[PDB]
């Protein structure tokens, strides 16, 4: 069993779909796409709604002491300029 | 001066009075200067005048026998058909120079003491790294394969067709001397290989394109530079 | 060797008049006596063969 | 040693299929945000004279 | 400005913004996503090496030092 | 027209012979004179009729490769060995005027110009030799008026279409289009992918006989009979009401390729795929429809002349098929193969009609009368063979 011969005959097997011949080129692939999990850095093209939500969500999980006061404020002072907006009620 | 002014000049002065007799003479004398070259220069100035008057009375000896015959095949008879055409299947170069590991990895030495650790070993004659090579990190990479010495491509030439075409190369099949210089895909004579032979529009009974040949190295690439190969047809 | 056979290409490229920037009358002579497309041929030949 | 699988094609490919795996492979370099799956395994290989006239016309 | 040079760049090529500070850096996160996705395609080796190409002072060693932390 | 009948016996055995036959054509005019072309330096004529030898033609110095009979049938040329051409009265059995010469390298080919294209008084000869050229010779001068190069490789076949076209197939991978008038070429088609062995033209059978015909009669006059001629090679080549000449190109590449070079230019009509080994002869049937190759792969096929579409196979011998030949009523075919055997197969059932065993040796040369009377075999044993029902 130790021998290396140059070329290696195939053994038939019962029972089981012959297997594609030496010279068969296989075409097939799958393809993954690649994607930056980054957000817009200007924040200026979602509008005041999102903005609403996004700094709620921030304000709830956000890790950061600053930050969460910041969103917090932010939110506060739009629902002190106008109580109509308020997006999530 | 504009235009053919030394021709003009020859034209409406002529020449020195003595230039025909001296050109006369000279070309007398060019036997005997020729003949004190012959038995006078030395050194490489030497070699190549009686290379250069070798083939000179070479094509002189030629030029004499077609004036003088100016006026005047295999065994077996075949039809035009069978004409320029040709069991054991051979290689054509079945034994070649076993190779030493010497030869093949020379030692890397790394560290900073004077003793220091010779693990690493580069291969000295050209590989194949193959097909989308990153080289291993180098803290792990035994057997290092240096980019300059790394081949893409060969010089196969068709033995029926008598034609060479530059071929990629898809993989490197046997190296005679070791298994391991064959997973290390060298480049060395009598190696056989895998070649795309897409360009000589090879096919088979039906229409497939076979695009992968096995070809024999029959160079030596660490001394010539270059790889050069022979398909198995 | 490549330093001697650069330089001598480099010598006779530099040289020769480039016909792209003459004046059209010294570029047209030169077409007429000249086939400039076997003038070009020659000195691109030359400076494929230096690189 | 002497074998006869020396003589043989290595690889084939019929001109349907290489033809839809040029396009297709094609389309996947169109888009630079997709990476291929073992491209190693895969058959990159088939993916991957007027001065001449003029001088045999004319020397 | 940034941002339109983002979106001139992912026109391109797969961009990530980034302030390397190892203190207060900015896109670690999406950078540390990024290598994890590409170690996921490249499963099958041991391990996968990045390499940081640039001019000089464009913070090569910097964005490395954010990511390790060190 | 008139129905010809497949030859099942041995007619007459003559040896003559001392080398092995490489080259046999029957006369255009009547299947009574067979001439053959031999390794012994010499071509040779026979009277069928009798099964006797009339003339032996000497002057070669090298195996005569070549033997190819004038459209009129009174000139009969032979291509040898040694770089010549010679032309040689059949009638007499003399050499007209002197050898050919200028040919650098081996003869292999020859292509009488058709009788509805001669001028000035003269025959024009294309000779394709192994130096990669074809030059085109005046028979009655003995003179070159053009040299077509441009070949990398020996020029293994050539053919003279009634356009005044030329047809080079050459070993360089190549088959090349040229104008017979100017001396220049006009395609150069470069799809096969081995040497080119052997081309055929759609046109080849009436080309060989010009105005002869089942009718045995000659016109009084010359321009009666190069109308006529012009006729017959009209009508054979008439497709869609247009005169297209169609070319077809075996090669070693296990392929043909299929040309219309006046409707199609350089794109090829069809590849006829199929063989599993070298295709060594092809030819179409008189008819224009049908097409039949005898491959290195101890078999015979036969296509469609239109697409170029597999109709049937004819598989019986056991040794490569070295050549095909048709009847003229494009129903039979008679192969001869290296295995020592002709067979005659019947193509509209597609099946063997009779086998022709006798030679000894491996068959080279065969040919079938264009009146289908005989059918002309040569080879290794050193003697010709007749054929007949």
């Not at chain 5, 999406?30 to 391990?47: A, G, M, P």
């Not at chain 6, 090298?62 to 004038?70: D, K, Y």
């Not at chain 6, 040694?82 to 010469?101: A, I, L």
Request: aromatic share 8%; charged share 25%.
């Amino acid at each position: 069993k130790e021998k290396q011969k140059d070329f290696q005959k195939p053994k038939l097997k019962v029972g089981k779909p012959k297997q594609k011949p030496s010279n068969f080129t296989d075409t097939s692939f799958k393809t993954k796409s690649i994607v930056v999990n980054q957000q817009t850095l200007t924040t200026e093209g979602l509008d005041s709604a999102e903005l609403f939500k996004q700094n709620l969500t921030l304000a709830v999980n956000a890790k950061s002491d600053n930050q969460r006061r910041d969103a917090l404020a932010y939110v506060t002072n739009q629902l002190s300029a106008n109580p109509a907006n308020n997006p999530v009620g | 001066p504009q235009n053919e002014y030394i021709e003009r000049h020859r034209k409406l002065h002529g020449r020195r009075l003595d230039a025909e007799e001296r050109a006369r003479k000279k070309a007398a004398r060019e036997g005997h200067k020729n003949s004190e070259n012959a038995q006078n220069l030395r050194g490489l100035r030497a070699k190549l005048y009686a290379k250069q008057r070798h083939a000179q009375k070479i094509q002189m000896r030629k030029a004499i026998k077609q004036h003088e015959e100016r006026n005047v095949e295999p065994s077996d008879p075949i039809p035009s058909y069978l004409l320029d055409r040709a069991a054991r299947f051979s290689v054509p170069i079945p034994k070649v120079r076993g190779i030493s590991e010497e030869e093949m990895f020379k030692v890397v030495k790394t560290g900073k003491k004077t003793h220091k650790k010779g693990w690493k070993r580069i291969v000295t004659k050209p590989t194949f790294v193959g097909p989308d090579f990153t080289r291993r990190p180098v803290k792990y990479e035994r057997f290092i394969r240096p980019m300059g010495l790394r081949y893409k491509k060969a010089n196969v030439t068709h033995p029926t067709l008598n034609v060479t075409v530059q071929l990629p190369i898809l993989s490197v099949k046997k190296n005679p001397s070791n298994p391991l210089y064959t997973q290390l895909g060298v480049l060395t004579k009598g190696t056989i290989i895998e070649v795309n032979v897409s360009d000589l529009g090879i096919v088979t009974a039906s229409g497939k394109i076979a695009w992968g040949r096995y070809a024999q190295i029959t160079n030596n690439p660490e001394n010539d530079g270059c790889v050069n190969a022979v398909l198995l047809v | 060797t490549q330093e001697t056979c650069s330089e001598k290409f480099g010598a006779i490229i530099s040289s020769f008049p480039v016909l792209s920037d003459q004046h059209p009358f010294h570029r047209d002579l030169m077409n007429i006596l000249y086939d400039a497309d076997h003038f070009k041929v020659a000195l691109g030949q030359i400076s494929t063969a230096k690189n | 040693e002497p074998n006869r699988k020396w003589f043989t094609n290595t690889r084939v490919i019929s001109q349907d299929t290489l033809q839809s795996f040029r396009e297709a492979m094609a389309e996947k370099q169109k888009d630079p945000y997709t990476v291929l799956l073992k491209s190693n395994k895969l058959p990159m290989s088939l993916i991957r004279h007027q001065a001449k006239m003029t001088i045999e016309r004319e020397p | 400005q940034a941002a339109a040079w983002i979106r001139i760049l992912q026109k391109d090529h797969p961009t990530c913004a980034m302030r390397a500070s190892i203190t207060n850096p900015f896109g670690r996160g999406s950078l540390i996503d990024l290598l994890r996705q590409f170690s996921v395609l490249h499963k099958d080796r041991k391990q996968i090496s990045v390499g940081l190409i640039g001019y000089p002072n464009v913070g090569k060693s910097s964005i490395i030092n954010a990511l390790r932390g060190k | 027209i008139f129905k010809v009948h497949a030859v099942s016996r041995l007619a007459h055995r003559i040896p003559g012979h001392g080398q092995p036959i490489l080259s046999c054509q029957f006369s255009p005019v009547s299947s009574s004179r067979l001439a053959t072309g031999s390794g012994d330096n010499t071509a040779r004529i026979w009277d069928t009729d009798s099964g006797t030898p009339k003339f032996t033609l000497k002057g070669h110095t090298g195996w005569v490769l070549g033997v190819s009979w004038s459209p009129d049938g009174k000139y009969l040329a032979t291509c040898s060995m040694d770089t010549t051409v010679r032309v040689w009265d059949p009638e007499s059995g003399k050499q007209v005027n002197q050898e050919f010469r200028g040919h650098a390298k081996w003869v292999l080919a020859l292509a009488w110009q058709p009788y509805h294209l001669w001028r000035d008084g003269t025959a024009r000869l294309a000779s394709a030799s192994k130096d990669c050229t074809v030059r085109i010779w005046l028979v009655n001068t003995g003179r070159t008026e053009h040299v077509l190069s441009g070949h990398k490789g020996s020029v293994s076949c050539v053919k003279w279409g009634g356009t005044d076209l030329i047809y080079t197939g050459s070993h360089d991978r190549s088959v090349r289009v040229w104008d017979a008038v100017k001396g220049t070429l006009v395609h150069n088609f470069t799809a096969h992918g081995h040497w080119v062995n052997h081309i055929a033209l759609s046109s080849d059978h009436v080309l060989r006989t010009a105005y002869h015909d089942h009718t045995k009669e000659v016109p009084g006059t010359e321009e009666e009979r190069r109308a006529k001629a012009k006729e017959r090679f009209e009508k054979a080549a008439k497709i869609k009401g247009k005169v297209a000449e169609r070319l077809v190109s075996a090669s070693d590449d296990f392929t043909m390729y299929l040309w219309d070079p006046t409707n199609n230019g350089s794109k090829p009509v069809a590849r006829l795929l199929g063989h599993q080994n070298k295709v060594n002869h092809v030819q179409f049937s008189p008819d224009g429809t049908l097409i039949a190759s005898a491959g290195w792969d101890n078999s015979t096929k036969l296509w469609n002349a239109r697409d170029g579409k597999f109709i049937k196979n004819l598989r019986g011998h056991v040794a490569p098929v070295y050549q095909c030949a048709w009847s003229a009523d494009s129903r039979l075919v008679v192969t001869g193969s290296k295995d020592c055997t002709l067979k005659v197969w019947n193509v509209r059932t597609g099946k063997l009609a009779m086998d022709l065993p006798g030679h000894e040796d491996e068959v080279y040369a065969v040919d079938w009368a264009a009146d289908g009377e005989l059918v002309a075999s040569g080879g290794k044993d050193k003697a010709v063979r007749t054929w007949r029902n």
